[PDB]
C-alpha atoms as an extended CHARMM CRD file, in Angstrom:
* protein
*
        98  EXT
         1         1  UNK       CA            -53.2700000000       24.4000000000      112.2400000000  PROA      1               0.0000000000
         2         2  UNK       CA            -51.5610000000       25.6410000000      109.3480000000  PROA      2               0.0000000000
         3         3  UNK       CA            -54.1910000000       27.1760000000      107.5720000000  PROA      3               0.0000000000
         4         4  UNK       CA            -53.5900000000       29.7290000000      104.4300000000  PROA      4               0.0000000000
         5         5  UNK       CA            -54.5940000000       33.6560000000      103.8460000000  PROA      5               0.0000000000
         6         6  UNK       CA            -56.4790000000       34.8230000000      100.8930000000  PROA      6               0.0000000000
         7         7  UNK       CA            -56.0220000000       38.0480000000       99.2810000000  PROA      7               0.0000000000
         8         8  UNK       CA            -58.6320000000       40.2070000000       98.6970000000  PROA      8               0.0000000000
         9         9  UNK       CA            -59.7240000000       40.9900000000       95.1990000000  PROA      9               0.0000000000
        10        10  UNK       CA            -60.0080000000       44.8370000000       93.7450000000  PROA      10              0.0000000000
        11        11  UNK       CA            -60.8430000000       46.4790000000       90.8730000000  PROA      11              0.0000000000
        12        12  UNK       CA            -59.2430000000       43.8170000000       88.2330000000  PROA      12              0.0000000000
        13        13  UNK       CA            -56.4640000000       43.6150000000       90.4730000000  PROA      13              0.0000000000
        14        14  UNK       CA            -55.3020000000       41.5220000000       94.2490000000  PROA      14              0.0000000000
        15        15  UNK       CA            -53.6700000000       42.6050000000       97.4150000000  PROA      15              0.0000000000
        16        16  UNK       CA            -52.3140000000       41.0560000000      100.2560000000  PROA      16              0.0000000000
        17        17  UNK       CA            -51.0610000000       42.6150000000      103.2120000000  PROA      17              0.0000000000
        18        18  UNK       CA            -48.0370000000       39.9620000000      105.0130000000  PROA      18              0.0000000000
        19        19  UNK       CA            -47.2110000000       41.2780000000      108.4760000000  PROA      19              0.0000000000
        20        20  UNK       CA            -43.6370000000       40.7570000000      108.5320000000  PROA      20              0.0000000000
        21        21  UNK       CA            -42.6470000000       40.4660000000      112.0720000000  PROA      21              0.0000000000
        22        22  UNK       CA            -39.8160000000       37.6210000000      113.2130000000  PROA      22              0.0000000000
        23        23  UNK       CA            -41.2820000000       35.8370000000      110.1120000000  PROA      23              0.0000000000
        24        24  UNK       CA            -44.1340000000       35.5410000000      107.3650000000  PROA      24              0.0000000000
        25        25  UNK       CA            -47.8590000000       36.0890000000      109.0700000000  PROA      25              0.0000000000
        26        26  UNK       CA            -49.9290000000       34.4690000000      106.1310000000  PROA      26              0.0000000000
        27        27  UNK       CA            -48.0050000000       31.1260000000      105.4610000000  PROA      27              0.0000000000
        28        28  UNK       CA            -49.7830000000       30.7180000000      102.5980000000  PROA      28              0.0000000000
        29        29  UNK       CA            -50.8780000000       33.2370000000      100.1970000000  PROA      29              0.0000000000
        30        30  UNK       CA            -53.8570000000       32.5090000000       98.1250000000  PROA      30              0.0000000000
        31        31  UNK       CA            -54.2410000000       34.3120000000       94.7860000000  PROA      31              0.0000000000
        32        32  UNK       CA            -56.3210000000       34.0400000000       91.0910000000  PROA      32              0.0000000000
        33        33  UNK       CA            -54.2080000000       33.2550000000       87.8910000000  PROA      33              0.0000000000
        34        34  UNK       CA            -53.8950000000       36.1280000000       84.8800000000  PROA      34              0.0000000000
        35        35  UNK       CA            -54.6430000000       39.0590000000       87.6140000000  PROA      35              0.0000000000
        36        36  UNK       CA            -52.3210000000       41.9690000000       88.4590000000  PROA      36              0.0000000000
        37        37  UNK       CA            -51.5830000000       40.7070000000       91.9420000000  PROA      37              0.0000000000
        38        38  UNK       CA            -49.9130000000       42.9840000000       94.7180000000  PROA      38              0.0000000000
        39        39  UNK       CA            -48.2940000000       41.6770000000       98.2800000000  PROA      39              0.0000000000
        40        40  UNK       CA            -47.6340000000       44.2260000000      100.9250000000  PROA      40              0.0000000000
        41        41  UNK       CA            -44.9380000000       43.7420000000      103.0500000000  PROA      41              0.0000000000
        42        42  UNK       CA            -45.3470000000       45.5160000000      106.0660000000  PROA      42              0.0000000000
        43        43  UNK       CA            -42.3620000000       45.4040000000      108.3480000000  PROA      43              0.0000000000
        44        44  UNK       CA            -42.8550000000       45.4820000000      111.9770000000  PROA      44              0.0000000000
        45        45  UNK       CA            -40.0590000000       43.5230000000      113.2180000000  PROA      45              0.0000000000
        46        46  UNK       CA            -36.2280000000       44.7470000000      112.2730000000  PROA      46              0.0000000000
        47        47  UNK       CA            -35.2760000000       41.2240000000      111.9480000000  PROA      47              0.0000000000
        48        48  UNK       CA            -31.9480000000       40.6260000000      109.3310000000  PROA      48              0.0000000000
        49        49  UNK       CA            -33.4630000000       37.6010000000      107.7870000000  PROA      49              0.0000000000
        50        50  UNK       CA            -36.1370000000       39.6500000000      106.8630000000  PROA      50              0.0000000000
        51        51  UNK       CA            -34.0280000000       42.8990000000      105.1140000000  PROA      51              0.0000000000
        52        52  UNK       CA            -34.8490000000       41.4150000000      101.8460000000  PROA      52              0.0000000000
        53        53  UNK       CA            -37.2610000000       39.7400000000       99.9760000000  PROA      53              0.0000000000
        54        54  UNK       CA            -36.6100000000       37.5960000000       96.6500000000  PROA      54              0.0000000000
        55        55  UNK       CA            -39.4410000000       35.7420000000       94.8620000000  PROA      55              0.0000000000
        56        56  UNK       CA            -37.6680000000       32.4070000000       93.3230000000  PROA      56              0.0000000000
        57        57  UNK       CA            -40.7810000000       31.6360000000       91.4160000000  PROA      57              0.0000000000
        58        58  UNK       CA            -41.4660000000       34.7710000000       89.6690000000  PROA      58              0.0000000000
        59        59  UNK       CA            -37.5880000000       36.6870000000       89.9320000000  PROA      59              0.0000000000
        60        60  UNK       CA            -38.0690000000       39.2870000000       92.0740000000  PROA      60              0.0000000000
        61        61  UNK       CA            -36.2180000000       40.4930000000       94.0900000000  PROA      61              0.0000000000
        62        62  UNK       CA            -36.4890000000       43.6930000000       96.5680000000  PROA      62              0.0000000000
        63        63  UNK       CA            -35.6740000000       45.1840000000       99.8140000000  PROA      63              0.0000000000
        64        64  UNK       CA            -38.2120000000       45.7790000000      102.6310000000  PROA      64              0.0000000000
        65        65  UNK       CA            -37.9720000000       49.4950000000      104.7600000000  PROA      65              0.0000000000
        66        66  UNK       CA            -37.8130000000       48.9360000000      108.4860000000  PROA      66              0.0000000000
        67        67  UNK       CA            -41.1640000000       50.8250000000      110.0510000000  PROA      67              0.0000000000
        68        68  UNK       CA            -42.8900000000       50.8490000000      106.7490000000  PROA      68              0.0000000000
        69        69  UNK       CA            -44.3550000000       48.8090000000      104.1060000000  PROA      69              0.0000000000
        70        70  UNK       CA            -43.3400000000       47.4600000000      100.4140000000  PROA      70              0.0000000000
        71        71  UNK       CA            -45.3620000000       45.9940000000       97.9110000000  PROA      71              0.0000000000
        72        72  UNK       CA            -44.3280000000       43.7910000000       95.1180000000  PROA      72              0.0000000000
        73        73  UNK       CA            -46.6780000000       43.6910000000       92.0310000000  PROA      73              0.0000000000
        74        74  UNK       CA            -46.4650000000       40.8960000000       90.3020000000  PROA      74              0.0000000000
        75        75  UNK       CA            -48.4430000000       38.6070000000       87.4580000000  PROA      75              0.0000000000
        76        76  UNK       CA            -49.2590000000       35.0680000000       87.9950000000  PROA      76              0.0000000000
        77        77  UNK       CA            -50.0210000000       33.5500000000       84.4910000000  PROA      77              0.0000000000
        78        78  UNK       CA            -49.7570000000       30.1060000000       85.9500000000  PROA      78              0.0000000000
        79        79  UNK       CA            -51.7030000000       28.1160000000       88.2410000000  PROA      79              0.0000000000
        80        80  UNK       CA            -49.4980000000       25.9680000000       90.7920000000  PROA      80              0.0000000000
        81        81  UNK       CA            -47.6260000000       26.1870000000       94.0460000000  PROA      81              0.0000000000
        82        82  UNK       CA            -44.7290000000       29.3300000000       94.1210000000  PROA      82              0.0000000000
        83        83  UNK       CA            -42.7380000000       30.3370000000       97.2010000000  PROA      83              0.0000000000
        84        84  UNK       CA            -40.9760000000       33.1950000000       98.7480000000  PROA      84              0.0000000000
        85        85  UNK       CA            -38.4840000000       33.3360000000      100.6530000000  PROA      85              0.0000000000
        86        86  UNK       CA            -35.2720000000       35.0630000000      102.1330000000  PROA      86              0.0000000000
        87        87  UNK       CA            -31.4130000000       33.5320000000      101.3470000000  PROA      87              0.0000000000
        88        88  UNK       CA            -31.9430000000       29.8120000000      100.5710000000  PROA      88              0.0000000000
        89        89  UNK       CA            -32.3890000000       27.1440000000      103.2280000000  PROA      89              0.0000000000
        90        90  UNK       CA            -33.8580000000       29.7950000000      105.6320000000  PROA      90              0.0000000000
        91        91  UNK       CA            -37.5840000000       31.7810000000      106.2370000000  PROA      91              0.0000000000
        92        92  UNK       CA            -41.1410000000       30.3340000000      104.8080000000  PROA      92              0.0000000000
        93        93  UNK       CA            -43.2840000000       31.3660000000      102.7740000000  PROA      93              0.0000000000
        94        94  UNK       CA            -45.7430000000       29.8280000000      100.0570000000  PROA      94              0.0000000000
        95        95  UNK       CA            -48.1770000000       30.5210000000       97.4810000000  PROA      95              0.0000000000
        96        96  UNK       CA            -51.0190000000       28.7650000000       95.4550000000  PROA      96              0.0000000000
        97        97  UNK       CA            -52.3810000000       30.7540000000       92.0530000000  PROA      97              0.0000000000
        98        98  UNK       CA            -55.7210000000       29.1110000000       91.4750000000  PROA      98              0.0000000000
Protein backbone atom coordinates (compact mmCIF):
# COMPACT_ATOMS: atom_id res chain seq x y z
CA UNK A 1 0.00 0.00 0.00
CA UNK A 2 2.80 2.23 -0.05
CA UNK A 3 2.42 3.79 -3.19
CA UNK A 4 4.46 7.16 -4.28
CA UNK A 5 3.20 10.91 -5.36
CA UNK A 6 4.25 12.55 -8.49
CA UNK A 7 4.77 16.12 -8.89
CA UNK A 8 3.25 17.95 -11.37
CA UNK A 9 5.26 19.50 -14.12
CA UNK A 10 5.09 23.51 -15.05
CA UNK A 11 6.47 25.74 -17.24
CA UNK A 12 10.23 24.17 -17.33
CA UNK A 13 9.90 23.77 -13.79
CA UNK A 14 8.10 20.91 -10.86
CA UNK A 15 6.05 21.31 -7.78
CA UNK A 16 4.94 19.26 -5.16
CA UNK A 17 2.71 20.11 -2.50
CA UNK A 18 3.62 17.54 0.96
CA UNK A 19 0.85 17.96 3.51
CA UNK A 20 2.78 17.98 6.57
CA UNK A 21 0.52 16.87 9.27
CA UNK A 22 1.93 14.27 12.22
CA UNK A 23 4.23 13.22 9.30
CA UNK A 24 5.08 13.27 5.42
CA UNK A 25 1.65 12.77 3.17
CA UNK A 26 3.47 11.74 -0.17
CA UNK A 27 6.03 9.03 1.04
CA UNK A 28 7.55 9.17 -1.99
CA UNK A 29 8.14 12.06 -4.14
CA UNK A 30 8.53 11.50 -7.77
CA UNK A 31 10.45 14.07 -9.82
CA UNK A 32 12.45 14.52 -13.55
CA UNK A 33 16.34 14.97 -13.46
CA UNK A 34 18.03 18.57 -14.72
CA UNK A 35 14.54 20.49 -13.85
CA UNK A 36 14.13 23.37 -11.37
CA UNK A 37 12.10 21.32 -8.93
CA UNK A 38 10.00 22.97 -6.00
CA UNK A 39 8.37 20.99 -2.78
CA UNK A 40 5.78 22.78 -0.77
CA UNK A 41 5.59 22.13 2.63
CA UNK A 42 2.41 22.93 3.92
CA UNK A 43 2.12 22.63 7.65
CA UNK A 44 -1.07 21.64 9.15
CA UNK A 45 -0.04 19.85 12.14
CA UNK A 46 2.28 21.83 14.92
CA UNK A 47 4.12 18.72 15.48
CA UNK A 48 8.10 19.36 16.91
CA UNK A 49 9.51 16.68 14.75
CA UNK A 50 8.26 18.49 12.03
CA UNK A 51 9.73 22.37 12.97
CA UNK A 52 12.40 21.74 10.52
CA UNK A 53 13.20 20.30 7.45
CA UNK A 54 16.87 19.28 6.20
CA UNK A 55 17.45 17.59 2.81
CA UNK A 56 20.62 15.10 3.44
CA UNK A 57 20.82 14.44 -0.23
CA UNK A 58 20.90 17.80 -1.66
CA UNK A 59 22.06 20.12 1.81
CA UNK A 60 19.29 21.93 2.58
CA UNK A 61 18.23 22.79 5.24
CA UNK A 62 15.10 25.11 6.39
CA UNK A 63 12.44 25.75 8.83
CA UNK A 64 8.71 25.17 8.17
CA UNK A 65 5.96 28.15 9.57
CA UNK A 66 3.22 26.62 11.66
CA UNK A 67 -0.32 27.49 9.68
CA UNK A 68 1.45 28.17 6.47
CA UNK A 69 3.46 26.74 3.79
CA UNK A 70 7.37 26.62 2.68
CA UNK A 71 8.81 25.62 -0.39
CA UNK A 72 12.26 24.45 -1.03
CA UNK A 73 13.58 24.86 -4.66
CA UNK A 74 15.95 22.71 -5.45
CA UNK A 75 17.95 21.02 -8.68
CA UNK A 76 18.20 17.39 -9.16
CA UNK A 77 21.11 16.80 -11.69
CA UNK A 78 21.14 13.17 -10.77
CA UNK A 79 18.93 10.36 -11.25
CA UNK A 80 18.66 7.94 -8.08
CA UNK A 81 16.93 7.53 -4.77
CA UNK A 82 17.36 10.92 -2.20
CA UNK A 83 15.58 11.33 1.14
CA UNK A 84 14.34 13.88 3.51
CA UNK A 85 14.03 13.85 6.63
CA UNK A 86 13.93 15.56 10.18
CA UNK A 87 17.00 14.89 13.01
CA UNK A 88 18.51 11.49 12.07
CA UNK A 89 16.98 8.16 13.04
CA UNK A 90 13.47 9.80 13.11
CA UNK A 91 10.48 10.97 10.31
CA UNK A 92 10.28 9.47 6.51
CA UNK A 93 10.50 10.69 3.63
CA UNK A 94 11.92 9.61 0.08
CA UNK A 95 12.54 10.62 -3.33
CA UNK A 96 13.27 9.09 -6.85
CA UNK A 97 14.70 11.72 -9.76
CA UNK A 98 13.98 9.82 -12.94
Amino acid sequence: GAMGQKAQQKNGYQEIRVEVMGGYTPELIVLKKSVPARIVFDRKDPSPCLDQIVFPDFGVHANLPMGEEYVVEITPEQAGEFSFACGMNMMHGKMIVE
